[PDB]
Design a protein around this motif. Structure first.
Motif, short mmCIF file in Angstrom:
data_model
loop_
_atom_site.label_atom_id
_atom_site.label_comp_id
_atom_site.label_asym_id
_atom_site.label_seq_id
_atom_site.Cartn_x
_atom_site.Cartn_y
_atom_site.Cartn_z
N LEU A 190 0.80 -1.20 0.00
CA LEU A 190 0.00 0.00 0.00
C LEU A 190 0.85 1.27 0.00
O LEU A 190 0.49 2.25 -0.69
N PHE A 191 2.02 1.28 0.62
CA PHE A 191 2.86 2.46 0.72
C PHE A 191 4.27 2.08 0.33
O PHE A 191 5.07 1.75 1.17
N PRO A 192 4.56 2.04 -0.96
CA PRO A 192 5.87 1.65 -1.42
C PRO A 192 6.89 2.75 -1.32
O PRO A 192 6.63 3.92 -1.08
N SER A 193 8.15 2.36 -1.36
CA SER A 193 9.27 3.29 -1.44
C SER A 193 9.23 3.95 -2.82
O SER A 193 8.72 3.31 -3.75
N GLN A 194 10.05 4.98 -2.99
CA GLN A 194 10.16 5.63 -4.28
C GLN A 194 10.85 4.77 -5.33
O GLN A 194 10.45 4.96 -6.48
N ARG A 195 11.49 3.68 -4.96
CA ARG A 195 12.01 2.66 -5.84
C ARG A 195 11.10 1.45 -5.85
O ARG A 195 11.41 0.25 -5.90
N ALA A 196 9.83 1.73 -5.60
CA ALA A 196 8.73 0.80 -5.63
C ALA A 196 8.99 -0.53 -4.94
O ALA A 196 8.65 -1.59 -5.47
N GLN A 197 9.47 -0.51 -3.70
CA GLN A 197 9.55 -1.75 -2.94
C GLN A 197 8.93 -1.49 -1.57
O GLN A 197 8.39 -0.43 -1.30
N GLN A 198 8.82 -2.60 -0.85
CA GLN A 198 8.28 -2.49 0.49
C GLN A 198 9.26 -1.64 1.31
O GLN A 198 10.46 -1.88 1.28
N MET A 199 8.68 -0.71 2.04
CA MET A 199 9.51 0.13 2.92
C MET A 199 9.53 -0.52 4.29
O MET A 199 8.74 -1.44 4.59
N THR A 200 10.45 -0.20 5.19
CA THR A 200 10.40 -0.70 6.56
C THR A 200 10.05 0.31 7.63
O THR A 200 10.36 1.49 7.45
N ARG A 201 9.97 -0.18 8.88
CA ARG A 201 9.82 0.65 10.06
C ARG A 201 10.89 1.76 10.15
O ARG A 201 10.65 2.92 10.47
N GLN A 202 12.13 1.36 9.97
CA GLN A 202 13.31 2.15 10.00
C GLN A 202 13.41 3.12 8.82
O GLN A 202 13.66 4.32 9.01
N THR A 203 13.05 2.67 7.60
CA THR A 203 13.07 3.56 6.44
C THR A 203 11.98 4.62 6.55
O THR A 203 12.20 5.76 6.12
N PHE A 204 10.88 4.33 7.26
CA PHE A 204 9.89 5.39 7.43
C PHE A 204 10.18 6.23 8.66
O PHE A 204 9.65 7.36 8.80
N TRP A 205 10.96 5.71 9.61
CA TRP A 205 11.20 6.57 10.79
C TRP A 205 12.15 7.70 10.36
O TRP A 205 11.87 8.87 10.67
N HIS A 206 12.98 7.50 9.34
CA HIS A 206 13.78 8.56 8.72
C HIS A 206 12.92 9.72 8.27
O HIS A 206 13.17 10.85 8.72
N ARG A 207 11.82 9.44 7.56
CA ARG A 207 10.88 10.40 7.09
C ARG A 207 10.25 11.14 8.27
O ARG A 207 10.06 12.34 8.20
N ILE A 208 9.94 10.42 9.33
CA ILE A 208 9.37 11.03 10.52
C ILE A 208 10.37 12.03 11.10
O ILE A 208 9.90 13.13 11.42
N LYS A 209 11.68 11.68 11.16
CA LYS A 209 12.63 12.66 11.68
C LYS A 209 12.68 13.94 10.81
O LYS A 209 12.46 15.06 11.28
N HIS A 210 12.75 13.70 9.48
CA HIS A 210 12.70 14.84 8.55
C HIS A 210 11.46 15.64 8.80
O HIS A 210 11.61 16.81 9.10
#
Length: 271
Positions: A190-210
């Motif tokens: 439902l919410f893929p990365s910009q390289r169209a793969q599954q994102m993780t907890r850690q890859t989205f917590w980066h976005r939360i910090k930003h």
């Protein structure tokens, strides 16, 4: 109620792709003797004190494993705000305004950031954990029903209502965001990365910090639990749909707040 509080803990424990059904059931075990033990002594999850916990542990002895379940659970209720203190220690950092800025940070004309907005408005409304948001598939969602389908420890599937605002963001994201992240690459995610793969907890917590950073929140000190508890409180103090869940609810716990919210919302939905 206290035994449910252990299922909620193990659930959250099982969420962090951590431990083992072993170490989990060794915890169910140890904590359930522990609440038996405490309830017998009058005591409760809410009131058991460190001395009470020091006793128990002494009542024979594995003391290590029992100390481990007791410290994890008791770090967990403290993090959830179920209790203000962590009784096992020896054995709410966020403003409404920072929660408002953070949710307003993401630039909704970039596909990436409107994914990030959508995921944040789902977090804020449902109380899901990052862990649950990231593995959600296109199959776990029904905007026309207003609900998302969450898998759990077992194949415990439940439905958590999204509310009007999350449905809206999710809608706007299915039109202007997801499709631009996939460029016709098919994934059920439902919410893929910009390289169209599954994102993780850690890859989205980066976005939360930003986003946190732009909102003037200390990014490196934000934790999932103070975020999850600040959303739950803001939602509770502001949400539209949950009129008198504020008048039927006190020393609010994260999970108790979202449980109420889910119950009122599903109630309105089945009507």
């Amino acid at each position: 109620q206290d035994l449910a509080r252990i299922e909620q803990f193990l659930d959250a424990l099982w969420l962090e792709k951590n431990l083992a059904e072993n170490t989990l059931n060794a915890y169910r075990r140890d904590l359930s003797m522990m609440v038996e033990w405490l309830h017998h002594r009058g005591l409760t999850l809410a009131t058991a004190q460190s001395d009470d916990l020091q006793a128990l542990l002494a009542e024979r002895l594995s003391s290590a494993r029992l100390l481990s379940a007791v410290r994890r659970l008791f770090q967990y209720l403290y993090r959830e705000k179920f209790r203000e203190d962590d009784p096992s220690a020896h054995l709410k950092d966020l403003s409404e305004a920072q929660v408002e800025r953070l949710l307003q940070a993401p630039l909704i004309d970039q596909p990436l950031e409107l994914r990030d907005k959508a995921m944040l408005e789902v977090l804020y409304a449902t109380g899901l954990r990052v862990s649950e948001l990231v593995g959600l598939t296109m199959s776990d969602i029904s905007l026309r029903q207003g609900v998302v389908r969450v898998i759990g420890k077992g194949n415990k599937e439940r439905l958590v209502p999204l509310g009007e605002e999350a449905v809206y963001w999710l809608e706007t994201y299915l039109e202007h965001g997801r499709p631009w992240l996939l460029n016709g690459v098919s994934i059920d995610v439902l919410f893929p990365s910009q390289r169209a793969q599954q994102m993780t907890r850690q890859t989205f917590w980066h976005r939360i910090k930003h986003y946190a950073v732009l909102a003037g929140i200390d990014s490196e000190k934000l934790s999932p639990h103070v975020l999850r508890h600040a959303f739950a409180t803001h939602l509770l103090n502001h949400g539209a749909d949950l009129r008198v869940v504020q008048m039927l609810l006190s020393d609010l716990s994260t999970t108790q707040i979202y449980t109420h919210v889910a119950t009122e919302r599903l109630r309105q939905l089945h009507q």
